């Protein structure tokens, strides 16, 4: 432990700590959750501070040697080398000013090790305020999370579902509506439905990016840009785009809206929440399809991933659909916290940013990781019980309707009843009731009862 | 009372519905609230378009189809809103309300001498599962395009007009509710206007999927027992007759019946708009707070006496209506997502509940946005001189004095200005700082609070 | 020209529909708030009428109001309470958040009624004597909610509990396979499952009763801000005594703290949490029941639900129940949102909170009785099918754990599935009948009804 | 050499050489890398306590050899104490029964015992008489009950006491009431704080009211609630040991063993109380930051203690952000709670994460709020009295003498002419037989108008 002195007081910080006094005071002020910023927010703070130093150097406001040291330090933070140097609670001052100062202090300590003296506020925070920085970092992280990680994971899941839909194009089975027997579908058609939900999910995320990517940087304390260069925003954004390749980043359409509100995070959480709703449907159908082996639906077999029960030997459970539906619940909860924070800004500043940031970035992370796992450890290895599915379809009261024009709906209903009673196919029941004659050939019967043709699947 | 038929069922004399509707009436006495006029309208539009297409394809006799088209137009025109008694909380496919529509059409046609079978004729090529969701998405799409977006535009334009009027009305900023550097009222209102403009963008961005219709998918999405092009033909007629260009056949017919994800998506946009409106309305009632113990920045138009007991008091009732509507939209949004997530296999069976909530959220936001615009925003007046005096008295504006008198003396100016409740300018003077290091002209340039707000400068015209 | 008359308030003159019993302030509110198109419910109008009568009674008792005026208010308030004048309450739910407009609606309509019997009442000075909207509208709201809880919801839940409990008794020995993670588990009885459902509803009643000490708190007497200004010091205790006497609801009480009772609506938030928990319970019960009724061929086909429209019946009441639960969850979020956002001496989200909490009580009340009477009571069990499912679960190997150990039991279950044999046959075929396991042991242990430990 | 082979009924698994977990835990490490966060200290504590108690009872009943039971009890005590938290690597977002974390505890106990020369089978011995399906929700409800009783209620009591202390200190500090954000009649700062204190007091009542069901434990129901493979009194014996060790008398066996496993309704109920407390805290914190606002542009009614380093209301901001998180967590909890199927609700680890977090946030921020914000507030007494006297609504007690409509005209003219209400009553010639100047000055005393009660 080393000793430091702010105005006014003495504070002890850990010897290995690169943060300084203001960060240590915040550590002492907010012992609330014990959880600090995630890797992605820390990275984005590093990206922002490097770009700001670049621009301050470019405009002749910051000595090049100082700028170069900030840029080098900030690069180390952005590269994830100092994730342990950010100890401040998520539940901190609502502008995120404490984490902003944490970044400035850590950068100055890194630079000191290379022989360059940096003032955390006067140099590392030059042209910035305690209010346009943390939300800028939040939107960088969220935009990067969307574009570089979530959309590719969703595409991977989409592609897995679509491949199954193709494999199972002719795997006929009974539809279910209201959980009751219905006319035939194919397993491929159902999975093409799941694939569309994920594809629409990607479209939903893409549609929020024009506003998610808006950055407040340059608006300084109240959105007016006082004490910054007039073009600071567009210059900093240009550097960030050039360096990251994230072309979705842009200066805000209105500098006051970009600090008074965090509506872009609320909008984006809505898209994540819709994806959670879709994933809930997909995962719950899939675990119901896999239910059994003997007292359930037994339509498909999920890959085994681990023993199911500490007490019931040999049982295996749909653990990936469970992870997906729990993740979806968490995204829904996080979404409510985000909206609550978003609605409650006042005048020139929304002061729920650290909480909103935690929730939106966690939702991105959970959906990204569980989507890849779902695709790779569950969807890819599904196998269908093809004969079981076809037998139930061919035995269903739902398929007697195309018999009506041959034998009348009365006799069709009798066929339906006897088929259930004897657990027979409709076909065999028609034969056993002696209905094959000049009225109905066996070839006409097989045409009328072609359950795959009833599913009306496009041939390829 | 009349008797019908299984049977036997008693139905009110002047009722155009028949036995199945009356059964549903007896099965679901839950909320006492039925379909809204917009949903009834959409069912009418859909039934008329289906009859047109069945007629075109030679599946339905022209005189039967003509009778359906005439009856459906009456329903769509709002002539029979009292003929749909079934609870919202009905069978989750909306099949009861679908049959309600079929029965009412058949009764209307009967009065014209034409006999229609509610199922075989009016429900021809349709199922108990692709129709109610189609009508829901028609209603929601119309609500978005024909009503909500124009109402939001009206509010945007009213906010933007105030931003323009108040372009030079300088005041102190507030961050964390604490004194901050100068802004203008016009800047704040341009921020509010952007939030509403962004709200319109959000609604527009959900329309490609909100406008997707299930019609043609029949019982499970396969289109069994309908013509293969039933969907595209019905959509063609609907778009031609209504002008609702956003309507389209669904990209995937199973997704369009197994899920209502487009309603969940659209509710998110409405919910974000509710979040924006909460900010805007809160700020405005705080700006209007007082008259003497609050912020007193602006005056809201009086709309009614404030209090049954405190005489003369007037309250920010339009902001209250807006923030209460926003809470309702947030609650409706949670119900919609809950319904959306819980479909099974080929059918989501939460449609009537989801429909009730999404359409009510459209309606509330539409109506309160226009009232907010017209009865509050349009008539706001600013206490211009009060605002400016507070800005000119702020410790936050001494910074541009630093390069003239040093930051230590600037802090002393700040301290003294507060203690004496004087402006910074007057304090600088009262401390004898005006000499050859600082002329009065220089002082006024440095302490120009409007320039500190950095408002955009307009051109010479 | 003869379509309207002129009324006035402190803001000026207002044209009012000629036949309307309301006056200037109601009419302003009609024009200010055309938002949802829906006004106060019957139950809300009743509680407002009841409250106004009770206030006039107490003002009469204390000699503050002339008995002739007091009697006219009490007479008119009773007409309002009984539902004679619901069409004279046109104001939207989404009005000023104190309910000022609906309070004046009641004052003005009472004044107009009393005018027809020859008595002149000032809507503020007489009908609203000793009162504010800020204590009377939350009081009317909590009266309605307390009444909904005690007189309607709890009895409806008890009816549902009793229907569930009767099935648990009737089906006490109907053995079936338990399911966990949706996969084949050890035996249970249908009766045991329904005893679980009954407990959830019983616990639901316990949750509603636990909120009553704060739901029943009334703000009446606090007037403008909670200080009681312009009311007798004992106005609250006296009005509540009249209320208790007239309604029979002993749960109504004066607030513990008069400032908390007006600055916040925390008791409505609290009560919504109990309703939301009940919606969560109902979702589980209804989902299980529609899955048990599923199929028959493609589903579990465990039970048959009564057919209501008009054998493969759609589970229409489970669908109504789970949709109602979704609504209660949505209403609950709206209520908490309004609840959190009070400022200083007043929470101004009351009409919206009232709309949602009263609707949640109504939906749960009505759907629970329907569910109990028209679904639960007439359920029939496919007893032989259920026993066959119980017998076929590979997890019936579980009671052999103490005899052959977890790992060998797992090997048994897997082979039985692979070779399509019973567990008993597989235990035999694996040569496990020996020193530490006999056929007698299996007859004892593999008995599926005994395994359910009923 | 950096790994070893372990096995389960699904096959062989490579496990890090130094790890005390075994095959099923390692499978779960690979199956669920989702959030990157595992069980909390309190959850691992409760799991350790529970395994120890189970071994004690199995020993008592002669079902488990004493030296095996002793080894389990000793290992479980080390886990409970926190010596092995680094041995619990499994994600929160695992199988929804918590099977993986249950086997995590079983495997780590087996490895700890092996070091002392005792061989335990993770299933047959450490998991004897148990399922994940009764033990994981039992450990969850133990942890939740302990959080409520030993941590949250004392934290709320501390906040209540700090607020009540201000209500006393400021009992006669008169100010203007505000309703709809507009000028109302007088209140005292103390009266307002007595309202805040009651909200927190009611919050404690709300937490106390959920304990009879929060404290219900599924232990003994094993796989589905029937108690199969467990002694008929396993549950009650285990609960007695837990109550004795923890001192938590609120722990109890479940009223119905099927409800206790098929649903997690007690967590949903408890979250509702926490959500209500968040709603209260939001009102309290908002009022306090608005009272401290400005000073020039705001209300400037009170001064908040400066914490870093015009002081920003950072603790009210922490409180309102925590409340938002509690509301979010509460929605996640209800969602998981609703979606059980048949004999098991499979959202337990997610529901546990969220309810335990909500307890923790409310506990810690309530203590910080009490000590570092509420206790040091100072009132601007003269400014507050000036606000009270300036409100035009102070005309209200004249209603009985001049009627509502005239009093309204008085308030309107006072505002217009920038005069006091007293002068305006005079200017309008209202002093007469129905209102003397002595009555007027009696009725307009703002402290008296606040009607603060005798102490
Ligand atoms: Cl297809
Ligand atoms: Cl390790």
DSSP states of B55-105 as a string?
HHTTSS-HHHHHHHHHHHHHHHTTS-GGG----SSS-TT-HHHHHHHHHHH
Locus of tokens 């589903």: C299
Q: Is residue B416 within 8 Å of residue B427, measured between CB atoms?
A: yes
Query: At A96, is the secondary structure helix, strand, or coil?
Result: coil
Angle CA(C421)–CA(C426)–CA(C430) in degrees, nearest 5?
A: 145
In chain C the first and final C-alpha atoms are separated, in Å, by: 80
C-alpha distances in angstroms, A325 versus A278, A341, D372? 10, 25, 40
CA angle D120, D124, D129 (to 5 degrees): 120
Q: How far is CA D370 from CA A34, C238, D120, D231, D424, in A?
A: 19, 37, 49, 48, 44
Whole-angstrom CA distances from C454 to A3, B388, C195, C447 are 69, 81, 12, 12
According to CATH, the topology of domain A2-128 is: Fumarase C; Chain B, domain 1 (1.10.275)
Contacts 24+ apart (CB under 8 A), D397-402: D397/C229, D397/C230, D397/D185, D397/D443, D397/D444, D397/D449, D398/D425, D398/D435, D398/D440, D398/D443, D399/B309, D399/B311, D399/C125, D399/C230, D400/C230, D401/D434, D401/D435, D401/D439, D401/D443, D402/D430, D402/D434, D402/D435
* Mutation choice for B interface testing from D174, D177, D179, D181 by most B CBs within 10 A: D181
Q: Give the dihedral sign, CA D447/D449/D450/D455.
A: positive
Class of the CATH domain delimited by B2-126: mainly alpha
Instruction: State the DSSP string of D195-232.
Output: HHHHHHHHHHHHHHHHHHHHTEE-TT-TTTSS-TTS-T
Asked about C181 being catalytic, the answer comes back as yes
Architecture of domain C396-451: Orthogonal Bundle (1.10)
CA distance C90 to D59: 73
| CA distances for D166 relative to C266, D151, D163, D303, angstroms | 22, 23, 5, 13
User: Nearest-CA neighbor of C207 among C279, C273, C286, C265?
Assistant: C273
Side-chain half-sphere exposure of A422, counting CA atoms within 13 A? 15
Nearest to A224 among B181, B275, B337 (CB): B181
**Residue B409, class by beta-carbon neighbours within 10 Å (0-12 exposed, 13-18 middle, 19+ buried)?**
middle
Q: CA-CA distance, D379 to A362, in Å (whole number)? A: 41
Cβ atoms of D298 and B295 within 8 Å: the answer is: yes
Residue C254: strand, helix, or coil: strand
Closest Cα partner for D123 from D7, D285, D274?
D7
- Give the distance (Å) from ligand 1 centre to CA of residue B138: 24
Residues comprising chain D, all counted? 455
CATH class of domain segment(s) A399-454: mainly alpha
Summary count for chain D: helices (H), strands (E): 17, 8
Q: What share of chain B is helix, strand, coil (3-state, %, to 5)?
A: 60, 5, 35
Is-contact B68 B384, C-beta < 8 A? no
CB within 8 Å of D156: residues ≥ 6 apart:
D200, D203, D204, D207, D277, D362, D366
Going by the DSSP 8-state scheme, the letter that residue A130 receives in this structure is: T
Retrieve residue C440's tokens: 């007698």
Q: Domain D4-130 is in which class?
A: mainly alpha
Q: Please say whether the beta carbons of D361 and D322 come within 8 A.
A: yes
- The closest alpha carbon to A101, from A122, A136, A125, belongs to A125
Burial of D82 (0-12, 13-18, 19+ CB in 10 A): exposed
State the greatest distance between any 2 C-alpha atoms of chain D, in Å, as a whole number: 105
Cα D327 to Cα D281: distance, rounded to the nearest angstrom = 12
C186 sits in which H/E element? strand C183-189
Helix H or strand E segment including A427: helix A426-432
Binding site of A for substrate, by residue number, is 95-97, 119-122, 129-131, 177, 310, 315-317
B403 is in an annotated binding site: no
Determine the Cα–Cα distance for residues D387 and D183; give it in Å rounded to an integer.
Answer: 9
- C-beta neighbour count of D378 within 10 angstroms: 10
Q: Is B421 on the interface with D (CB under 8 A)?
A: no
**Contact criterion met (CB below 8 Å) for A197 and B259:** yes
Element (H, E) at D235: helix D234-246
Closest C-alpha to A221, from B185, B403, B172: B172
d(CA C324, CA C344): 35
Minimum distance, in Å, between the CA of residue A195 and any CA atom of chain C = 24
D213/C273 Cα distance (integer angstroms): 14
Q: Is D407 on the interface with B (CB under 8 A)?
A: yes
Cα D171 to Cα D188, D192, D193, D257: the distances in Å are: 6, 9, 9, 52
Among residues C146, C48, C143, which one has the least CA distance to residue C100?
Answer: C48
Tokens 């005994």 belong to residue:
C450
- Calpha distance D216→D251 (Å, rounded): 6
Show which subunits contact D, needing at least 3 CB pairs below 8 angstroms. A, B, C
Q: Is A84 on the interface with D (CB under 8 A)?
A: no
Q: Judge whether B57 is closer than 8 Å to chain A, CB to CB.
A: no
Instruction: Note whether A182 and A398 are within 8 A (CB).
Output: yes
In contact, A303 and A376? CB cutoff 8 Å: no
Tell how far CA D322 is from the center of its chain.
10
Q: D240, D226, D18: which is closest to D134 by C-alpha?
A: D226
What does the domain layout of chain C look like in residue ranges?
Answer: 5-131, 132-395, 396-451
CA angle, C283 as apex, C277 and C287 as ends, to 5°? 160
For chain A, how many residues are written? 460
CB B322 within 8 A of CB A343: no
The fold of A129-398 is: Fumarase C; Chain A, domain 2 (1.20.200)
What does the DSSP assignment read for D117-132? T----IIIIITTT--H
Could you say which of A330, A341, A351 has the minimum Cβ distance to residue D332? Answer: A330
Residues contacting residue D114 through CB under 8 Å, at least 6 positions apart: D120
Q: Are B361 and B328 in contact (CB under 8 A)?
A: yes
Is the CB of residue B221 less than 8 Å from the CB of residue B258?
yes
Distance CA A270, CA A266 (A): 6
CATH number of the C5-131 domain: 1.10.275.10
User: Do C397 and A314 touch, CB atoms closer than 8 A?
Assistant: yes
- Which residues, listed in sequence order, are joined to residue A174 by a DSSP beta bridge? A184
Phi, psi at residue C4, to the nearest 5°? Answer: -135, 160
Domain at B127-396, CATH class: mainly alpha
* CATH for the stretch B397-452: 1.10.40.30
Chain discontinuities in chain D, listed by preceding residue (C to N exceeding 2.5 Å): 309
Q: What angle do CA C414, C418, C421 make, to 5 degrees?
A: 90
CATH 3.40.50.720 fits D394-449, yes or no: no
A215, C333 in Cβ contact below 8 A?
Answer: no
Contact C401 A291 (CB under 8 A): no
Beta-bridge mates of residue D127: none
CA proximity to A303, closest of A325, A318, A323, A322? A318
Give the Cα separation of D276 and D278 in Å (integer).
Answer: 5
CA distance to A5, B251, B252, C306, C325, per residue, from B42 (Å): 71, 21, 22, 32, 26
Interior/surface letters A23-53, b for 16+ CB within 10 angstroms, e for the rest: bbbbbebbebbeebbbebbbbbbbbbbbbbb
Q: Parallel, antiparallel, or unpaired: how do β-strands A172-177 and A180-186 relate?
A: antiparallel
Cβ-contact D303, D292 below 8 angstroms:
yes
A317 touches chain C (CB under 8 A): yes
Which residues in chain D have their CB less than 8 angstroms from residue A179's CB?
none
**Dihedral angle computed from the Cα positions of residues C383, C384, C390 and C394, in that order, rounded to the nearest 10 degrees:** -160
* DSSP assignment of A10-38: EEEE-TT----HHHHHHHHH--SSS----
Helix (H) or strand (E) run with residue C183 in it? strand C183-189
Considering only CB atoms, which chain B residues are within 8 Å of D390? 292-293
**Cα-to-centroid distance, D88 and ligand 2 (Å):** 8
Measure the CA–CA gap between D221 and D262, rounded to whole angstroms. Answer: 11
Distance (Å, whole) CA C138 – CA C223: 11
- Which ligand sits nearest to residue A459's alpha carbon? 1
Neighbouring C-alpha atoms within 13 Å toward the C-beta of D242: 35
**Burial of B224 from C-beta contacts in 10 A (0-12 / 13-18 / 19+):** buried
Read off φ and ψ for residue D386, nearest 5 degrees: -60, -40
Instruction: Enumerate residues 6+ apart whose C-beta is below 8 A from B365.
Output: B148, B151, B152, B270, B273, B274, B277, B325, B329
- CA dist D91 and D66 (Å) reads 34
DSSP-derived 3-state class of residue D378? strand
Choose among A125, A127, A133, A139: nearest CA to A93: A133
Tokens of B230: 């039933």
In a 13 Å sphere around the CA of D30, the CA atoms on its Cβ side amount to: 13
B60: tokens are 């339905």
Structure tokens at D298: 């705001």
**How is C420-437 classified by DSSP, letter by letter?**
T--HHHHHHHTT--BTTB
Pairing mode, strands B248-249 and B212-213: parallel
Q: What dotted CATH number matches D131-393?
A: 1.20.200.10
Domain C132-395 has CATH 3.40.50.10860: no
Q: With beta carbons less than 8 A apart as the criterion, state whether D266 and D214 touch.
A: yes
d(CA C182, CA C174): 20
Kindly report the number of other CB atoms within 10 A of residue B460's CB atom. 3
Contact (CB, 8 A) for C267 and C215: yes
Q: How far apart are CA A259 and CA D374, in angstroms?
A: 29
Q: Which helix (H) or strand (E) holds C304?
A: strand C303-304
Number of H helices, E strands in chain C: 17, 8
How many CB atoms sit inside 10 A of residue A122's CB? Answer: 11
CA–centroid distance for D124 within its chain:
38
Where do runs of H (alpha helix) occur along A187-230? 187-212
Rounded Cα gap, residues D225 and D203, in angstroms: 33
Only one residue has tokens 């309606």, namely B363
- Do C102 and C40 touch, CB atoms closer than 8 A? yes
Q: Give the 3-state secondary structure of residue C229.
A: coil
| DSSP string of B290-320, one letter each residue | BSSSS---EEPPP-S---SSSTT----HHHH
Beta pairing class for A250-251 and A214-215: parallel
Q: Give the number of whichever ligand sits closest to the CA of residue D20.
A: 2
Question: What does the angle CA A423 – CA A426 – CA A431 come to, to the nearest 5 degrees?
Answer: 105
């Amino acid at each position: 432990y080393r000793i430091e002195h702010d105005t006014m007081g003495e504070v002890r910080v850990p010897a290995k700590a690169l943060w300084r006094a203001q960060t240590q005071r915040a550590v002492e002020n907010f012992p609330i959750s014990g959880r600090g910023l995630e890797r992605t927010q820390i990275r984005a703070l590093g990206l922002l501070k490097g770009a700001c130093a670049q621009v301050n150097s470019d405009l002749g406001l910051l000595a090049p040697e100082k700028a170069d040291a900030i840029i080098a330090a900030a690069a180390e933070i952005a590269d994830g080398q100092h994730d342990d140097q950010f100890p401040i609670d998520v539940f901190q001052t609502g502008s995120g000013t404490s984490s902003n100062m944490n970044t400035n202090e850590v950068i100055a300590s890194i630079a000191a090790k290379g022989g360059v003296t940096l003032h955390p506020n006067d140099d590392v925070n030059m042209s910035q305020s305690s209010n346009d920085t943390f939300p800028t970092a939040t939107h960088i992280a969220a935009t990067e999370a969307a574009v570089a990680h979530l959309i590719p994971a969703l595409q991977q899941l989409h592609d897995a579902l679509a491949a199954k839909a193709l494999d199972w194009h002719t795997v006929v089975k009974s539809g279910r509506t209201h959980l009751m027997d219905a006319v035939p579908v194919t397993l491929g058609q159902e999975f093409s439905g799941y694939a569309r939900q994920i594809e629409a999910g990607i479209e939903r995320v893409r549609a929020c990016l024009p506003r998610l990517g808006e950055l407040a940087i340059g608006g300084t304390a109240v959105g007016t840009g006082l004490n910054a260069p007039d073009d600071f925003g567009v210059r900093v954004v240009a550097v960030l785009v050039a360096q990251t390749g994230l072309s979705e980043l842009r200066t805000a359409a209105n500098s006051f809206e970009a600090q008074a509100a965090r509506d872009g995070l609320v909008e984006a959480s809505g898209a994540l929440r819709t994806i959670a709703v879709s994933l809930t449907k997909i995962a719950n159908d899939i675990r119901w399809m896999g239910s059994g082996p003997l007292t359930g639906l037994a339509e498909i077999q999920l890959p085994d991933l681990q023993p199911g029960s500490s007490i019931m030997p040999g049982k295996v459970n749909p653990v990936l659909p469970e992870a997906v539906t729990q993740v979806a619940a968490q995204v829904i909860g996080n979404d409510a916290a985000i909206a609550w924070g978003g609605a409650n800004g006042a005048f020139e500043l929304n002061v729920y940013i650290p909480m909103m940031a935690r929730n939106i970035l966690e939702s991105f992370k959970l959906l990204t990781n569980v989507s890849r796992l779902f695709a790779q450890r569950c969807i890819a290895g599904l196998t269908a019980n093809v004969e079981h599915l076809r037998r139930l379809a061919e035995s269903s009261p739902s398929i007697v309707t195309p018999l009506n024009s041959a034998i009348g709906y009365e006799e069709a209903a009798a066929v339906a009843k006897q088929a259930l009673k004897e657990r027979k196919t409709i076909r065999q029941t028609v034969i056993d009731r002696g209905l094959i004659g000049d009225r109905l050939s066996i070839e006409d019967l097989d045409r009328r009862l072609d359950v795959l043709a009833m599913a009306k699947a496009e041939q390829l």
